[PDB]
Structure formats: structure tokens, C-alpha cells
Amino acid sequence: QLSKQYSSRDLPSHTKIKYRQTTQDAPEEVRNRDFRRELEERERAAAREKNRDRWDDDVVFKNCAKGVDDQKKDKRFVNDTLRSEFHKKFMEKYIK
């Protein structure tokens, strides 16, 4: 009991299947590969790259800005929606 109804979505599209090619990374290559060596050497390379990369005679106050070097608050990622630094910035920006 199959209905003669249709729908736009259903119609043919992409009837061909893109098989992976040899340089894309066909399974043939994969089977032969020694992944572990490749993974190690890539890792080493990455590490190396990283290494390469790296008067007023009168006032109330003596210098406040002495050792204040920013701090890694934007390097910390926090899994807490209200104490993420992203949230702080958002809250700072949009409320007055």
C-alpha cells in the first residue's frame, strides 16, 4: 500500500558516490602505512616549530603599575558559564 505522494526534498541529487582517490587517501595506502613513525615525526616537527617560535612633586601615589603583567586569565579556559572570561567580556560589553 504505497502512496503516490511525493516531496521536493526527496528527488534525486548527488546520485554519484565520490570514491576516495589515491592522493585523497584511498584505503590501499592506509593499510600499507606505518602510522606510528609518521605520527612521531610530525609531532617532533611541530615541537621544533614551537621552539623556533619561542616634577609632579605632589601626588597621592607611588607607582601602582609595578609588576602587573596582565595575567593568564585569557589563557585559562573555564568550564563554568558564568565565570568564563568570555562571559565576563560579554557581560562587560553589553550592560552599560
Added chain:
Amino acid sequence: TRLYLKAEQERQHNYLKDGPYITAEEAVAVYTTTVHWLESRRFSPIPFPPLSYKH
């Protein structure tokens, strides 16, 4: 609105827990400085409005 009031409640609670940020000696510096200014400026204090005040 709700977020802002949350972080607000946070900042109030942290201001009570962590105490006044102005420290102390600083605050004395402010109060003293203001005093000197108003001194050299002959500023007389503003009194309380009397019962009979024509304005």
C-alpha cells in the same frame, strides 16, 4: 538583564567578602587632599534648608 544582575550580585558579595579595595592609607590621602582643596577655596558648607526659606 538576568546575567547582569547575576554578575552584579557576585560583585557585591565579593566586595563584602574581600573588603574595601581602596585599602586605607590611600583613602586617607583622598580625604586629606580634598580637605586641602576646599580649604584654599574658602568654600563654606551647605547648611540644611531651614523651615523658613524664601526660595
Added chain:
Amino acid sequence: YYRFNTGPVGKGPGCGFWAAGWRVWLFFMRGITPLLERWLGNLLARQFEGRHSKGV
């Protein structure tokens, strides 16, 4: 109309030279046909088979 009404001939009503306009509707129809077949097909099918119950 510009080219046709070039000389003595004026702005008057009489220019026949449809071929162009006629083409245009035919191209339209070439494409719209399959659409109407699919849409009218569904219309008929709903009419006779019934609106599908499930809304599945």
C-alpha cells in the same frame, strides 16, 4: 519597437514581430512543465488518495 519604428513609421499600434516574445514563454513553459506535473500530481493524489494521515 525602436528599430521597427524607425523612419516614416510612427508610434502607432501596429507592429507584428512576435517571434521573440513567443520564444520567451516557451522557455518558461519548458521548465515550469515538470514543476506543474509534480505539483498537480500531488494535488490529484491528495484529492484521490487522501491527505496523508500521519504527518509522520
Added chain:
Amino acid sequence: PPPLLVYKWCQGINNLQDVWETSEGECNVMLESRFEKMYEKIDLTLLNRLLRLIVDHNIADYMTAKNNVVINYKDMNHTNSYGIIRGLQFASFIVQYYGLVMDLLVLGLHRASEMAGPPQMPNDFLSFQDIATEAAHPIRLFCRYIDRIHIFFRFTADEARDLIQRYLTEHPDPNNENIVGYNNKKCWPRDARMRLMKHDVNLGRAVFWDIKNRLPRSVTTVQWENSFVSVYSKDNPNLLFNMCGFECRILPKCRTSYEEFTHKDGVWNLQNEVTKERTAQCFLRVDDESMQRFHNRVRQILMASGSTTFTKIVNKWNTALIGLMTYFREAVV
């Protein structure tokens, strides 16, 4: 009115003593900034003692005790024990007075007294009892509009060098190894090497840094991000700044003005009060954030009205549009 303030500010600059003369290496510095969080960081306990210096202790205790109340939105309730409430009727006076205090911090008492002058013969907005009071100090013009700071500096070469040497002193980071030591060729003459492009930034950052160090962080602060700096020196003809809604440029005729010319009223002529001469030109431009506000105002008219009558919308438009035009006028064109 605010735009008239802009005019007092421009002609105030142009009337300063020898203001545009770069002959000896003089350097002018315009600095604009905000106090960042100011309202929010006012301390009630301190604010009470500060008001006790002004008005009868009762008035002070009323004003203060008012800023301590409960904020409610639907479900939420909390107490505000720290930040000042803006929406109070008299909150204005608190803001301006506290701002007076922090001004006394920034300018320093000696200079500030010099500006307000003797209480027996106070001065106007911009002027001093004497010329020697102008030349007496680097700070020249100081304008504070609510929480915004507009400052204009005049430096002799020595004073500037000193400032640069102090900033470039304990302010290294030190960091920036790649930037700090950059190699170049000392074999050649200066002109055949790293010219002068950023060297102008130094004086600027030294300024902004010097200002910041006069404001204790717990009181208020100033963020380089929101601030802006401009510098006038033999390398830089143009002097840019932003007051209120107006973006202002100033080009002297003592610099390279080349062909002297008039133009639409968008060009102001800055006329020396002494010599009745037109010594420079100020160009006006409508600032970005302003345009943004207007655009959000139109968008407010479209969005907020789906129901309202068509005659009503046109009223909304007209009101906003004269709101822009009466205010900006010349700068619009």
C-alpha cells in the same frame, strides 16, 4: 551647549601661547579617555566622609543611605552595598563632586588651584590669570564632561624627553625580544636607515602612562583600549581629537597649509583673539558612535512599530531627524 563647548575648546587651543611653534622641537599632546568604571567603584563609606566635607551631616547621611537599597527584577532581589545608583534624582551631584575629587588627583592641587585661580577673582572656562601661569607647567587645557577626560599638553623638548625616559624605564615588560633589539645598519647616516614613524607613539604612551599612574586602581582606572591619543610635532601637522559627539581635526596655517582656501561652513576658522587673524582651521566630522546611535534610532522606529499609525511614524522620523540636524548641523555636510 555642548557644540559651543567644542568651539570654546578649539579657539581655546588656538589662543594658547606659541601653541603651534615647532621651531625648538616643541610637542603637543591631545589625550582623551574615560574613567572606565567610576560609578560602580565609588565606595559608600568613603562617599559619606566626602559628603560630610560639603553639606550638613544629615544631608550626607540621607544621600549615602539612599544608595544602599534593594534592587529587584521579577524573581531577583539583592542589596547594593558598594556601587552608586545612577537613577537617583540627586545622583548627578554625587557624580560631579566625586569627579571633582579625582580631578584634584589628576591635575594636582598646585596646578588645579592655578586653573580655578584665586576664589576672589575666579577664571572662566579656559584662561589663566597670566601668561606665565600658562607656561608654568605642561598641563594646559583640562576639560571634563561627566566621566570623560579631555586633556591638552604642551611640552618643551626637555620635559618630553624626561617623560619618555621614565616610561621607557621601568616600563619594558620587558618582553618583546624580537621588537626591542631589532638590528639595523649603523654604518650609514640616519636618513639611510629606520626613519621616524612610530617614534611619535613613545611620547604618547608616556603621556597616557603618566596620567594613569596618578589614579589608584582601586579608585578608578583608565584603559588604553578605550582611550585615544593624538600628537602634534614637526613630523605631524594634523591634530585630531574627539569631544562630545564631534570628531575634530585642526590644521594650522603655520604648518603646510599650501593654498589658503575657504569651503562650506563645515570648516571653522580659528581666529587669534589678540591679532584678529585666522591662524588655523578646524574640520568637523560626525563621530562614528553618533552615526551608530542615529541608525539604531531609525531601526528603533521601524522595529518597535508594527501596529502604530503611519502619521505616527512620520512624527517619529521627524523628531529623530531634527534631533540629529539641529545638533550637528555643519558637521553633517
Added chain:
Amino acid sequence: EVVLHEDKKYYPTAEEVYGPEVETIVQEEDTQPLTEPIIKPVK
């Protein structure tokens, strides 16, 4: 001593909690901006 609410740490440094041996890196954004292909075609 005193810390303004401007800073006030909550939570230990990212690195500290895990320990030294592991490397902790926060990737935000990305690289190889999208027009690039993961799996590049043959030619």
C-alpha cells in the same frame, strides 16, 4: 594584602591541575581556514 574584584582568581591555573607531564593547550579559533580541503582532490 588585597585583591580587587578586577582579578580575584577562581580555579587553579589550567596547567597546575593536570600536572606537568601532560601538555594542555587551548585551541580557540582554528587554522587552515575553511576554503581549504580536508582530503584534497586528485588532479
Added chain:
Amino acid sequence: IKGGVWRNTEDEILKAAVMKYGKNQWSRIASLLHRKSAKQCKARWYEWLDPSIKKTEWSREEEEKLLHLAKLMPTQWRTIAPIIGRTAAQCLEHYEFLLDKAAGVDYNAEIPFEKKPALGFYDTSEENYQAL
């Protein structure tokens, strides 16, 4: 015009209403009373009628604590009041008191859908049942 003095009738009815409806619905409670609004009902609950509020004399410790704190944070009553555990208006009155004294047929026809029980190793043939 709505403002005025609180009445025992309005106050008891406020007790009952708060009991029934709950703390977060004020507009519903203001609906029953006359000459009073929702804000006034809420603040009247949390200021005075609330049973968690402590109505009694102040012990010596509470006076020490109140005086010390009031000298610590002048004029801030809504900050101090929770610390001592009393109402702001109350600790105010007590403070001025301390300075004052100090100086259709698919059913009924045919068995809707029928599953005859499956049949298992025993005889169900014989069985039938009686009428009502």
C-alpha cells in the same frame, strides 16, 4: 491615595493569602485587598509580618554587634540588618533608642479486536461460563 495605615483585617488576610498562594505571586494577593498595591503587600510581608522576623528585646550581644557595625559602615542599614539578623527599620529604631537613652459497533456489537487465547497441553473445549 491608596497609601494608609495597616489594619488587622488587611494584615490577617495578608497572612492567609501568603499562606495559600505563595511568596512570589504578589499581584494575586494585592487583588484581594482593597486600598493596597502589590509592592506594598510584598514590602509589608518582608518588613514586618514575616514570621522569620525577630520581634523581641535586643540581647547584650546584639547591641554590641549593632553598635560596632554601625560605627563600621555608617548609615548602611540594609547591609547591617542581615548581619545581626534583624529588620532594617527595627535596628534603626533600636539604634536611635540607644543614642536616645544613652543621653460505533466496534464496541457493543462485535468484540473490538479479538485474541482468542492460545491453546496449551490441556482441554479448553469443555469450558463455558454463566450469565449475569
Added chain:
Amino acid sequence: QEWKIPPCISNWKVHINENFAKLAEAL
């Protein structure tokens, strides 16, 4: 007994630092 669950009957459906003393007495 442990897995008795408190009924979720619906309601819809503080400390201080001593630095305040040092400050206030200072002022």
C-alpha cells in the same frame, strides 16, 4: 530508605571582612 526522594514541592509551580573596621576607624 536512602533513595527516599524529598518531594520537589515547588516554590514556583552571609559573612563580612574585618578590613572594613580598619578602614572605617582610619577615616
